[PDB]
């Protein structure tokens, strides 16, 4: 029932619980932190191109940042490649695991196709 | 044989005809030595649609490499023969009734 | 005054079964002794977790008795993700990718597969 979109460019736009867009700009309000209860409400959301701009700046910087823009990532699952790339960067880092579940859809298809044909050539002959 | 731009010439008119092993195997004498020689082949390899191994050897020489990875196109098929097991249940089980 | 007999008697029970490999020298410089023998043996078992359990503690603080158990579910059949943690656990690793193999039949009944319709459509109508 509810669709909110954001683009980016200039000027200023505050509405009250949640998210919070960088680049300059002056502004002030009251209260602060919250990075990782902010930080939760952006991966189990949607944000399909518009996501991954964020990661790549917080796999580009900081070190607990990192870390968690990658749990970030884990728990939305479609979003690998780009993460090897961000640790081929500059020194040795720690992968996770996403291949296990794809070797299930691999040898299981080819038994599907087998048994597929052995019934539609017993049914004319 | 004689000088050397030859050489560089004839792999380089053998990208185009390209065939299996033929123009498989001919790329690894391309990396046996050379900079560049070893890389304009390099681009051979993939164009075979599918070939690793001579990836993954010459990648432990001394500086840094590369590497591209398929997938996907895979995952929009699995999708498809679950769309037919279904129909051609539906209906052969709507039929015994 | 002298008699000899010698009676020689020979039943062979088809049931003893000894499996010896090879693989001691390579170029490496650097070889770790004690344990070994015993293992490569009961390789020959595997299955089930407790089999998976095989290679917890023997892929941690051993070099030459880690290839020994890689050289192992290789000659089995599918098997993996452990296979990489152990990788991370602080150290590097060589040799794997035993599924490289299947990368083939399946674009291939890919490419076929899709032949084997746009035909009898453009058959049809």
Same mark, same amino acid.
């Given at each position: 029932?509810?669709?909110?979109?954001?683009?980016?460019?200039?000027?200023?736009? %505050?509405?009250?619980?949640?998210?919070?867009?960088?680049? &300059?700009?002056? +502004?002030?309000?009251?209260?602060?932190?919250?990075?990782?209860? !902010?930080? &939760?409400?952006?991966?189990?959301?949607?944000?399909?191109?518009?996501?991954? +701009?964020?990661?790549?700046?917080?796999?580009?910087? +900081?070190?607990?940042? =990192?870390?968690? !823009? =990658?749990?970030?990532? =884990?728990?939305?699952?479609?979003?690998?490649?780009?993460?090897?790339?961000?640790?081929?960067?500059?020194?040795?880092?720690?992968?996770?695991?996403?291949?296990?579940? &794809?070797?299930?859809?691999?040898? %299981?298809?080819?038994?599907?196709?087998?048994? !597929?044909? +052995?019934?539609?050539?017993?049914?004319?002959?």
């Amino acid at each position: 029932m509810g669709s909110s979109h954001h683009h980016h460019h200039h000027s200023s736009g %505050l509405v009250p619980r949640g998210s919070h867009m960088w680049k &300059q700009s002056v +502004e002030l309000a009251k209260k602060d932190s919250l990075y990782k209860d !902010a930080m &939760q409400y952006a991966s189990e959301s949607k944000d399909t191109e518009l996501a991954e +701009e964020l990661l790549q700046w917080f796999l580009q910087e +900081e070190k607990r940042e =990192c870390f968690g !823009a =990658c749990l970030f990532t =884990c728990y939305d699952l479609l979003r690998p490649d780009v993460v090897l790339e961000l640790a081929w960067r500059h020194n040795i880092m720690d992968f996770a695991m996403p291949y296990f579940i &794809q070797v299930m859809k691999e040898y %299981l298809t080819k038994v599907d196709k087998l048994d !597929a044909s +052995e019934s539609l050539r017993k049914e004319e002959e």
